[PDB]
């Protein structure tokens, strides 16, 4: 079950089969082996390429929401890694899966989020959107993405569900980076207006060790190879 | 069943329940109501927000590959709309779901595609990637995305599977735009080297009429509204 690690922020107990499987399957990469500049980039492919792990996530979340009452009415996944988990849950629960994307990616009349100023060190916040009317008054929305880091995207989700006159069931993430204090910051910002927002995570990045490092050991070549160069490595 | 509309290009017969449902659920948008400059932008949300339609797609493709022999070993979905359909099929078939994305989005050692020169009128081609070793020698990969238009992305998929010493089972798309002749062009380019590549589509855009137009009738406001402006339209 989920244990409260901090106010309205829950983590699956590490004895659960799902937590074990995620700990076993997850692979992280350092800067020279990833597309982002963070110490450890958690690769979502290490999860989607794992049939046993993907099904365990689907089974668990589907059982969670089917047992939930009042039951959720919508699943809102974040572009693009949230798209990998949302649909398989929504197809089982038989409720709509809504897409949160930048305006230049979404169709129809849209509603845009209002991110906070970037607190130095750059890292400009993303303005996200959902189609106007995709989520109606009285809807109970489950927000989903792969990794909860600073919480900037989660906040965009909250604002959009709020603006739609709907309520957030909870923000769910496969992995959370508790060091960046997303739940805490979101829970106290703007005079605790989002204090009631529940955050659930299936695994903490603190559970990831060097054993989860996907970096190529003793490698000195480039990170990216063309098709032609790879084709030359084998008979064809 | 699938009917051959042209060499190695199949379309689901329009009497099938799935084809009917897609025809009923699909919504398209003109430029002032979409993020792209094409006459009719097929909104994938009109499908994902439709529980009945999403499940029908999942059921059909899952039954197709379970009855297939030799059975597929991998599903390669295109960033980001291919991510919406691939995982729910892969979780059922119990095979890995690999991600095709730009290098600045993928982790690990990557293999990049080699797109052709843009044939005037601009529209610069995208260099796509998959992690080196995500698909091995002897793999049988199903490529998937929502809309098959010019085929530039599909070709990136073919090149990557080819470079990995694996074979393409088929390129599957929810919707195809037969006017842009993707299957034809891919089938004859480079001395018909991709002539054997099968293309399957669940619906042709020719089946979409004005009844599928999602444009707001007699609307004159902006396409995008902020959260604050929408919040002001209702008591809170
Ligand atoms: N260490 C990380 N590994 C993988 N993805 C990350 C990492 N840190 C941030 N991201 C992601 O970037 C998105 C934005 O994070 P956030 O700062 O919580 O808005 C998240 O959904 C994750 O996909
Ligand atoms: N009319 C359209 N509606 C929606 N998406 C489109 C349309 N035309 C092209 N696209 C997309 O842009 C991607 C690239 O198309 P392609 O030209 O086939 O490489 C496709 O996967 C579709 O998602
Ligand atoms: Mg995100
Ligand atoms: Mg694409």
d(CA A33, CA A40): 10
Kindly determine whether residue B163 and residue A132, on different chains, have CB atoms separated by under 8 Å: no
Listed resolution, Å: 2.0
Closest CA to B215 of A131, A108, A132, A133: A108
Smallest CA–CA distance, residue B50 to chain A, in Å, is: 6
- Write out chain B residues lying below 8 Å of A83, CB-based: 80-81, 83-84
Residue to probe by mutation, ligand 1, list A29, A147, A158, most atoms within 8 Å of CB = A147
Which residues 6+ apart lie within 8 Å of A122 measured at CB?
A: none
Task: Please name each of the domains of chain B with its CATH number.
Answer: 1-236 (3.40.50.2020)
Q: Which residues of A touch B160 (CB under 8 A)?
A: 227
Find, in chain A, the residue whose alpha carbon is nearest to that of B227.
A163
List, in order, residues 6 or more apart from B140 with CB less than 8 Å away.
Answer: B70, B71, B72, B73, B74, B166, B167, B169
The annotation status of B214 as a binding-site residue, yes or no, is no
Method: X-ray
Return residues 151-210 of A near B (CB < 8 Å): 159-160, 162-165
Q: Is the CB of A151 under 6 A from ligand 1?
A: yes
Four-residue CA torsion sign, A189, A193, A194, A196: positive
Determine whether the interchain pair B41/A160 forms a contact, defined as Cβ–Cβ distance below 8 Å.
no
Using a CB-CB cut-off of 8 Å, the residues of chain A touching B110 are 223-225
Question: A73-112: string of b/e by CB count within 10 Å (b at 16+)?
Answer: bbbbbbbbbbbbbbbbbbbbbebbbbbbbeeebbbbbbbb
Compute the distance between CA of residue A126 and CA of residue B78 in angstroms, rounded to an integer.
22
Q: Which stretches of chain B are assigned E, i.e. beta strand?
A: 2-6, 9-12, 28-29, 41-42, 74-78, 97-100, 110-112, 129-131, 140-148, 167-176, 199-204, 224-226
Residues ≥6 apart with Cβ < 8 Å to A65: A71, A72, A89, A93, A142
A153 with A129: CB under 8 angstroms? no
Our answer on whether the CB atom of A72 is closer than 6 Å to any ligand 1 atom is no
CA distance A43 to chain B (A): 6
């Amino acid at each position: 079950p989920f244990k409260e690690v901090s106010p309205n922020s829950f983590l699956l107990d590490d004895s659960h089969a799902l937590s074990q499987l995620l700990k076993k399957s997850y692979r992280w990469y350092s800067p020279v082996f990833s597309p982002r500049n963070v110490p450890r980039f958690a690769d979502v492919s290490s999860i989607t390429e794992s049939p046993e792990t993907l099904k365990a996530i689907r089974d668990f979340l589907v059982q969670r929401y089917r047992a939930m009452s009042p039951a959720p009415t919508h699943i809102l996944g974040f572009d693009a890694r949230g798209f990998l988990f949302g649909p398989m849950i929504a197809v089982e629960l038989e409720i709509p899966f809504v897409l949160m994307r930048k305006a230049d990616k979404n169709a129809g009349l849209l509603i845009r989020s209002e991110p906070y100023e970037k607190e130095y060190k750059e890292a400009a916040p993303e303005v996200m959107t959902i189609r106007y009317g995709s989520i109606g008054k009285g809807s109970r929305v489950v927000l989903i993405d792969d990794v909860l880091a600073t919480g900037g995207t989660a906040l965009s989700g909250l604002q959009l569900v709020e603006a739609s006159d709907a309520v957030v069931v909870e923000m769910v993430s496969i992995l959370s980076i508790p060091f960046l204090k997303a739940a805490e910051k979101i829970h106290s910002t703007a005079n605790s207006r989002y204090k009631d927002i529940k955050f659930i995570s299936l695994l903490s990045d603190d559970a990831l060790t060097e054993e989860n490092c996907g970096d190529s050991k003793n490698y000195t070549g480039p990170r990216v190879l063309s098709c032609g160069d790879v084709l030359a490595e084998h008979p064809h």
